[PDB]
Amino acid sequence: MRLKDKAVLITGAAHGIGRATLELFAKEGARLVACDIEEGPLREAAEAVGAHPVVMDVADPASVERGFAEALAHLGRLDGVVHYAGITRDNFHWKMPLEDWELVLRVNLTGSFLVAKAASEAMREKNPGSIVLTASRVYLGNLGQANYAASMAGVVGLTRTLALELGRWGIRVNTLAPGFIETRMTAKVPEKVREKAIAATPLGRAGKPLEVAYAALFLLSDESSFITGQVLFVDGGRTIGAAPA
Amino acid sequence: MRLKDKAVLITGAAHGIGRATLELFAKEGARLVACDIEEGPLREAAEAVGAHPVVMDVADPASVERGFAEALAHLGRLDGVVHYAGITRDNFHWKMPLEDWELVLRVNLTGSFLVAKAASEAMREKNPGSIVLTASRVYLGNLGQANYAASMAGVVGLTRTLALELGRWGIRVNTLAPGFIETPEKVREKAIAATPLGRAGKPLEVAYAALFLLSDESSFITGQVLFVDGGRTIGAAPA
Amino acid sequence: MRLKDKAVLITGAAHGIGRATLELFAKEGARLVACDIEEGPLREAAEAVGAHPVVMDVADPASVERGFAEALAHLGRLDGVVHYAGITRDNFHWKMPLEDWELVLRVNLTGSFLVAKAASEAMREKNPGSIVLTASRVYLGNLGQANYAASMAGVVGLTRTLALELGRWGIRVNTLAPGFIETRMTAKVPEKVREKAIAATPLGRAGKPLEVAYAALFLLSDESSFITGQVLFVDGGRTIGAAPA
Amino acid sequence: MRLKDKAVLITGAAHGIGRATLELFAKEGARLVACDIEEGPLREAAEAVGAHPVVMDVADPASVERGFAEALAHLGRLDGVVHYAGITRDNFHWKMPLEDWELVLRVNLTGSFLVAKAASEAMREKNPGSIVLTASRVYLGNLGQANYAASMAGVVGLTRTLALELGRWGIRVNTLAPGFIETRMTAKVPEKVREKAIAATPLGRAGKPLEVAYAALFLLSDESSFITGQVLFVDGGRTIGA
């Protein structure tokens, strides 16, 4: 087991990637705290794997704070954190309402800052550790996603800065950049659009949440002890070359 | 002249870089609209160049909106925009108050969004054009600047996305990433030491990069990050 | 005139991009030396502009050396160099003969080293200056171009190292990365190819040699005096979305 | 075990990073073929782990070819390859002799092309697989290393091209970019350099070959099944800000 007795907290743990990550980490022997917005599915997901459920709204500074206090009270320490909690509000920029722009930045960018800052305080000067922040292949720009791309590009920048500041404290910070992963949130994607995303993917298929989880496992485990400030794309090569269409 | 009759609006036009850009563009024959927060220094910088002063708080949606209306009413068209307006609130993350984090994002990232969105609105399907957003070499991460780096990194992401959505309309979107520009003591030596060209940059030099990006000489260039940092970023993984 | 009386040497000056650059640089007041492999078309292109023709095989160490001695004898100094000489030998890697791989590397990568080295020797410790090497948007990887991509990616790496070593000598080194430029080796490219590239280009058109020439003018003139070690893409946004390198 | 029954070939397996990878991959249950230039230390490193030694000069087309024929005769299939074999010839460009420039490219850049080409040929249309080529953080430019920087940057471009071409065949191609790794080569490096290297490393120390080995394990195993065309830096953050 790669996370034997490691205390890890995971956000957005109730669905898709967060869920698959919670399961993989549990099999790897981690002492977990599952966080998400909705208590109902949070408890179900957490119980199915033996983790401790803690409702958290990564968008609410107070919520993130209370959550980490509970997690620390329950775990006693923090060895790593994988942050997922993210949303989208697609629209070409000229039809994008300010409210939609500010909501995704608040949730994805500031939310990552709040969770990361909390993760840092729980570890800095206490023990070495590893923080994994999730951005997206889209941070490089993508049609109809100026807000998503800006917020996730911001997360990459945050990661590199945090990595610079925490390095001497044995704390690593890296960011995942998944591509088109099949989850409940992508079920709505139209078939003519799916055919198009897959065509721009050298590996010719959609990704599976377990695959993102493994990337997370690697970054959080001691096997990546000499890797920090990095952006790991898990998009099947979707970003090697630019996607037309 | 490279901006002969071109209608250009410039933000942060009262300060160093913006001011230097107003002067250059004026010499290049542009019909300018100067924008900034403080009327006093704005009016003066605009008058010395023959530009039309328009007070603007890029952090305020309504101000940006009224601003562009005045610019359009005065120019009749918009051919390019160079957005500078930016701020910092340094601190190691563990000492960085949320308020500080949200202010720089609001002013730097959301401000760039409001300005670019208005610029686009004035040009899309009307005429080709060029938009230049100013980021910073720090978007690659820098000690004590999590908020600044994240916001500028967002600007780079915004510019790329904008470049993709506007390309078919003949509108180019590019981003300037200045390094260490003149107007501090031991902070200077370390900076210059990490600079291959061995010196601080001058606002004029950043203005020239803006001139290039906005003129028709960069007509086939869009979605790019142009570092004007004296090579301070060579050797660092690009983002 | 941004190149008033500046001594400039251009390789591949007889071909599309180089020719347009000779013409623009001539208008900008530069004292030019035009280099290329075939004497006939070189003399024609040089004369049409008032440049001094010097036949050169950028792949031959001695040819490059002789060429630069002529250049210096005629110019007396070197203010800048713009290098364009390059070749392609497409094929999926499994059908690529070693010979084709070694040729494009020798010409494109080693050829840039030879020219950059000569240019540097002519300026280092004598006067500040600007050197512009031409890579390609394809350095980021492209179907059927393992050799071209590898060689052009090497040029970017070469540029970056050279900018670090020459920085203190007031000598700047930058790379141009042109996209689909309408010249002659493209005039009759099969219509489905021309269509492919344009669909992947946000500005929706092929680039013109003159446009690459202006980027060269910018980088070489005193207007980019504080810019070095950079990769300037001139591909109409065709690379937007691809993970940077 | 992460590489159970996986048939893998590793170059430069006799020393440092390659040897560490060989050892790790053996514990992970891989059926290995160790390749390196010197038979003496090659057989030793391979025998100590149960790998099959095959002498190979990555700079020689025929040598690489015979090597893979032996590897295949012994393995019967190829599931992955980790290429390390590289060299340096430092010097500021004005003092860098052509021969030194051509040797590092031939060995590092062409060498990788030869090994990746043989690896691809053994897998394309036969089975999905993973190819890991080793570049270096220096691919981004470094004082006194024009030739090394260019060769490694070329490997990054090669990796990306290969990834695009082999994706449809279920074959992934990724590249490692190690930083300052504590080896029996960096030991002699003058303290001037050491202090300068460690100082520019957020993690404040040199890397160990095992750490680079783990990165290779990840990229070669099915754990990175949806990752291709990537450059994974294993430099302790040295490349974050230069």
JSON list of N, CA and C in Angstrom, two decimals, chain B residues 180-217:
[
{"chain": "B", "resi": 180, "resn": "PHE", "atom": "N", "xyz": [11.13, 43.11, -15.06]},
{"chain": "B", "resi": 180, "resn": "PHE", "atom": "CA", "xyz": [11.48, 44.19, -14.13]},
{"chain": "B", "resi": 180, "resn": "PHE", "atom": "C", "xyz": [11.66, 45.51, -14.88]},
{"chain": "B", "resi": 181, "resn": "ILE", "atom": "N", "xyz": [10.65, 46.37, -14.78]},
{"chain": "B", "resi": 181, "resn": "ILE", "atom": "CA", "xyz": [10.63, 47.67, -15.45]},
{"chain": "B", "resi": 181, "resn": "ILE", "atom": "C", "xyz": [10.89, 48.78, -14.45]},
{"chain": "B", "resi": 182, "resn": "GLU", "atom": "N", "xyz": [11.73, 49.73, -14.84]},
{"chain": "B", "resi": 182, "resn": "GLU", "atom": "CA", "xyz": [12.10, 50.87, -14.00]},
{"chain": "B", "resi": 182, "resn": "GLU", "atom": "C", "xyz": [10.92, 51.76, -13.62]},
{"chain": "B", "resi": 183, "resn": "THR", "atom": "N", "xyz": [10.83, 52.09, -12.33]},
{"chain": "B", "resi": 183, "resn": "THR", "atom": "CA", "xyz": [9.77, 52.93, -11.77]},
{"chain": "B", "resi": 183, "resn": "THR", "atom": "C", "xyz": [8.46, 52.78, -12.53]},
{"chain": "B", "resi": 184, "resn": "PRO", "atom": "N", "xyz": [12.93, 50.23, -3.22]},
{"chain": "B", "resi": 184, "resn": "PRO", "atom": "CA", "xyz": [13.75, 49.35, -4.06]},
{"chain": "B", "resi": 184, "resn": "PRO", "atom": "C", "xyz": [15.24, 49.56, -3.82]},
{"chain": "B", "resi": 185, "resn": "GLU", "atom": "N", "xyz": [15.95, 48.49, -3.44]},
{"chain": "B", "resi": 185, "resn": "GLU", "atom": "CA", "xyz": [17.38, 48.58, -3.19]},
{"chain": "B", "resi": 185, "resn": "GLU", "atom": "C", "xyz": [18.10, 47.23, -3.38]},
{"chain": "B", "resi": 186, "resn": "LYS", "atom": "N", "xyz": [17.99, 46.35, -2.39]},
{"chain": "B", "resi": 186, "resn": "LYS", "atom": "CA", "xyz": [18.63, 45.04, -2.48]},
{"chain": "B", "resi": 186, "resn": "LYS", "atom": "C", "xyz": [17.76, 44.09, -3.28]},
{"chain": "B", "resi": 187, "resn": "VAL", "atom": "N", "xyz": [16.52, 44.51, -3.52]},
{"chain": "B", "resi": 187, "resn": "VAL", "atom": "CA", "xyz": [15.57, 43.72, -4.30]},
{"chain": "B", "resi": 187, "resn": "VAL", "atom": "C", "xyz": [15.95, 43.87, -5.76]},
{"chain": "B", "resi": 188, "resn": "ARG", "atom": "N", "xyz": [16.60, 44.99, -6.07]},
{"chain": "B", "resi": 188, "resn": "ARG", "atom": "CA", "xyz": [17.03, 45.30, -7.42]},
{"chain": "B", "resi": 188, "resn": "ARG", "atom": "C", "xyz": [18.18, 44.40, -7.87]},
{"chain": "B", "resi": 189, "resn": "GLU", "atom": "N", "xyz": [19.21, 44.29, -7.03]},
{"chain": "B", "resi": 189, "resn": "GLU", "atom": "CA", "xyz": [20.36, 43.47, -7.37]},
{"chain": "B", "resi": 189, "resn": "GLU", "atom": "C", "xyz": [20.00, 42.03, -7.68]},
{"chain": "B", "resi": 190, "resn": "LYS", "atom": "N", "xyz": [19.16, 41.42, -6.84]},
{"chain": "B", "resi": 190, "resn": "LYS", "atom": "CA", "xyz": [18.75, 40.04, -7.08]},
{"chain": "B", "resi": 190, "resn": "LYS", "atom": "C", "xyz": [18.01, 39.94, -8.41]},
{"chain": "B", "resi": 191, "resn": "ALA", "atom": "N", "xyz": [17.12, 40.89, -8.67]},
{"chain": "B", "resi": 191, "resn": "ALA", "atom": "CA", "xyz": [16.36, 40.91, -9.92]},
{"chain": "B", "resi": 191, "resn": "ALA", "atom": "C", "xyz": [17.30, 40.99, -11.13]},
{"chain": "B", "resi": 192, "resn": "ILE", "atom": "N", "xyz": [18.15, 42.01, -11.14]},
{"chain": "B", "resi": 192, "resn": "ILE", "atom": "CA", "xyz": [19.11, 42.22, -12.22]},
{"chain": "B", "resi": 192, "resn": "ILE", "atom": "C", "xyz": [20.10, 41.06, -12.33]},
{"chain": "B", "resi": 193, "resn": "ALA", "atom": "N", "xyz": [20.38, 40.42, -11.20]},
{"chain": "B", "resi": 193, "resn": "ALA", "atom": "CA", "xyz": [21.31, 39.30, -11.20]},
{"chain": "B", "resi": 193, "resn": "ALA", "atom": "C", "xyz": [20.67, 38.13, -11.94]},
{"chain": "B", "resi": 194, "resn": "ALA", "atom": "N", "xyz": [19.35, 38.02, -11.81]},
{"chain": "B", "resi": 194, "resn": "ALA", "atom": "CA", "xyz": [18.61, 36.94, -12.45]},
{"chain": "B", "resi": 194, "resn": "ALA", "atom": "C", "xyz": [18.19, 37.33, -13.87]},
{"chain": "B", "resi": 195, "resn": "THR", "atom": "N", "xyz": [18.74, 38.44, -14.36]},
{"chain": "B", "resi": 195, "resn": "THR", "atom": "CA", "xyz": [18.42, 38.95, -15.69]},
{"chain": "B", "resi": 195, "resn": "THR", "atom": "C", "xyz": [19.59, 38.85, -16.68]},
{"chain": "B", "resi": 196, "resn": "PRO", "atom": "N", "xyz": [19.48, 37.96, -17.67]},
{"chain": "B", "resi": 196, "resn": "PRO", "atom": "CA", "xyz": [20.56, 37.82, -18.66]},
{"chain": "B", "resi": 196, "resn": "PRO", "atom": "C", "xyz": [21.06, 39.13, -19.26]},
{"chain": "B", "resi": 197, "resn": "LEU", "atom": "N", "xyz": [20.15, 40.05, -19.57]},
{"chain": "B", "resi": 197, "resn": "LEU", "atom": "CA", "xyz": [20.55, 41.33, -20.14]},
{"chain": "B", "resi": 197, "resn": "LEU", "atom": "C", "xyz": [21.17, 42.27, -19.09]},
{"chain": "B", "resi": 198, "resn": "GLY", "atom": "N", "xyz": [21.22, 41.80, -17.85]},
{"chain": "B", "resi": 198, "resn": "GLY", "atom": "CA", "xyz": [21.82, 42.55, -16.76]},
{"chain": "B", "resi": 198, "resn": "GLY", "atom": "C", "xyz": [21.36, 43.96, -16.43]},
{"chain": "B", "resi": 199, "resn": "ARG", "atom": "N", "xyz": [20.05, 44.22, -16.51]},
{"chain": "B", "resi": 199, "resn": "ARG", "atom": "CA", "xyz": [19.52, 45.55, -16.21]},
{"chain": "B", "resi": 199, "resn": "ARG", "atom": "C", "xyz": [18.01, 45.56, -16.07]},
{"chain": "B", "resi": 200, "resn": "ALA", "atom": "N", "xyz": [17.49, 46.68, -15.60]},
{"chain": "B", "resi": 200, "resn": "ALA", "atom": "CA", "xyz": [16.06, 46.84, -15.46]},
{"chain": "B", "resi": 200, "resn": "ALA", "atom": "C", "xyz": [15.55, 47.26, -16.84]},
{"chain": "B", "resi": 201, "resn": "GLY", "atom": "N", "xyz": [14.28, 47.00, -17.11]},
{"chain": "B", "resi": 201, "resn": "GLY", "atom": "CA", "xyz": [13.73, 47.41, -18.39]},
{"chain": "B", "resi": 201, "resn": "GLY", "atom": "C", "xyz": [13.11, 48.79, -18.25]},
{"chain": "B", "resi": 202, "resn": "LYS", "atom": "N", "xyz": [12.90, 49.48, -19.36]},
{"chain": "B", "resi": 202, "resn": "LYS", "atom": "CA", "xyz": [12.29, 50.81, -19.33]},
{"chain": "B", "resi": 202, "resn": "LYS", "atom": "C", "xyz": [10.87, 50.73, -19.89]},
{"chain": "B", "resi": 203, "resn": "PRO", "atom": "N", "xyz": [9.98, 51.61, -19.43]},
{"chain": "B", "resi": 203, "resn": "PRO", "atom": "CA", "xyz": [8.61, 51.56, -19.94]},
{"chain": "B", "resi": 203, "resn": "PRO", "atom": "C", "xyz": [8.51, 51.66, -21.46]},
{"chain": "B", "resi": 204, "resn": "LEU", "atom": "N", "xyz": [9.39, 52.45, -22.07]},
{"chain": "B", "resi": 204, "resn": "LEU", "atom": "CA", "xyz": [9.39, 52.61, -23.52]},
{"chain": "B", "resi": 204, "resn": "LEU", "atom": "C", "xyz": [9.51, 51.25, -24.21]},
{"chain": "B", "resi": 205, "resn": "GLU", "atom": "N", "xyz": [10.40, 50.40, -23.69]},
{"chain": "B", "resi": 205, "resn": "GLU", "atom": "CA", "xyz": [10.62, 49.08, -24.26]},
{"chain": "B", "resi": 205, "resn": "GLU", "atom": "C", "xyz": [9.37, 48.22, -24.19]},
{"chain": "B", "resi": 206, "resn": "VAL", "atom": "N", "xyz": [8.58, 48.38, -23.13]},
{"chain": "B", "resi": 206, "resn": "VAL", "atom": "CA", "xyz": [7.35, 47.61, -23.04]},
{"chain": "B", "resi": 206, "resn": "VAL", "atom": "C", "xyz": [6.34, 48.23, -24.00]},
{"chain": "B", "resi": 207, "resn": "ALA", "atom": "N", "xyz": [6.43, 49.54, -24.18]},
{"chain": "B", "resi": 207, "resn": "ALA", "atom": "CA", "xyz": [5.53, 50.26, -25.08]},
{"chain": "B", "resi": 207, "resn": "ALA", "atom": "C", "xyz": [5.78, 49.79, -26.50]},
{"chain": "B", "resi": 208, "resn": "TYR", "atom": "N", "xyz": [7.05, 49.58, -26.85]},
{"chain": "B", "resi": 208, "resn": "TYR", "atom": "CA", "xyz": [7.38, 49.12, -28.18]},
{"chain": "B", "resi": 208, "resn": "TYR", "atom": "C", "xyz": [6.81, 47.74, -28.45]},
{"chain": "B", "resi": 209, "resn": "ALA", "atom": "N", "xyz": [6.75, 46.90, -27.42]},
{"chain": "B", "resi": 209, "resn": "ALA", "atom": "CA", "xyz": [6.20, 45.56, -27.60]},
{"chain": "B", "resi": 209, "resn": "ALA", "atom": "C", "xyz": [4.70, 45.68, -27.84]},
{"chain": "B", "resi": 210, "resn": "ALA", "atom": "N", "xyz": [4.10, 46.69, -27.22]},
{"chain": "B", "resi": 210, "resn": "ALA", "atom": "CA", "xyz": [2.67, 46.91, -27.38]},
{"chain": "B", "resi": 210, "resn": "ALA", "atom": "C", "xyz": [2.43, 47.45, -28.78]},
{"chain": "B", "resi": 211, "resn": "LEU", "atom": "N", "xyz": [3.32, 48.32, -29.24]},
{"chain": "B", "resi": 211, "resn": "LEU", "atom": "CA", "xyz": [3.19, 48.91, -30.57]},
{"chain": "B", "resi": 211, "resn": "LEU", "atom": "C", "xyz": [3.17, 47.79, -31.61]},
{"chain": "B", "resi": 212, "resn": "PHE", "atom": "N", "xyz": [4.12, 46.87, -31.49]},
{"chain": "B", "resi": 212, "resn": "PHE", "atom": "CA", "xyz": [4.23, 45.75, -32.41]},
{"chain": "B", "resi": 212, "resn": "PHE", "atom": "C", "xyz": [2.96, 44.91, -32.42]},
{"chain": "B", "resi": 213, "resn": "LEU", "atom": "N", "xyz": [2.55, 44.45, -31.25]},
{"chain": "B", "resi": 213, "resn": "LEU", "atom": "CA", "xyz": [1.36, 43.63, -31.11]},
{"chain": "B", "resi": 213, "resn": "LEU", "atom": "C", "xyz": [0.07, 44.27, -31.62]},
{"chain": "B", "resi": 214, "resn": "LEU", "atom": "N", "xyz": [-0.05, 45.59, -31.48]},
{"chain": "B", "resi": 214, "resn": "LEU", "atom": "CA", "xyz": [-1.25, 46.27, -31.90]},
{"chain": "B", "resi": 214, "resn": "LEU", "atom": "C", "xyz": [-1.25, 46.72, -33.36]},
{"chain": "B", "resi": 215, "resn": "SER", "atom": "N", "xyz": [-0.06, 46.95, -33.91]},
{"chain": "B", "resi": 215, "resn": "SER", "atom": "CA", "xyz": [0.06, 47.37, -35.30]},
{"chain": "B", "resi": 215, "resn": "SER", "atom": "C", "xyz": [-0.21, 46.21, -36.27]},
{"chain": "B", "resi": 216, "resn": "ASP", "atom": "N", "xyz": [-0.39, 46.53, -37.55]},
{"chain": "B", "resi": 216, "resn": "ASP", "atom": "CA", "xyz": [-0.65, 45.51, -38.57]},
{"chain": "B", "resi": 216, "resn": "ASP", "atom": "C", "xyz": [0.57, 44.66, -38.89]},
{"chain": "B", "resi": 217, "resn": "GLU", "atom": "N", "xyz": [1.69, 44.96, -38.23]},
{"chain": "B", "resi": 217, "resn": "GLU", "atom": "CA", "xyz": [2.92, 44.21, -38.44]},
{"chain": "B", "resi": 217, "resn": "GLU", "atom": "C", "xyz": [2.88, 42.86, -37.74]}
]
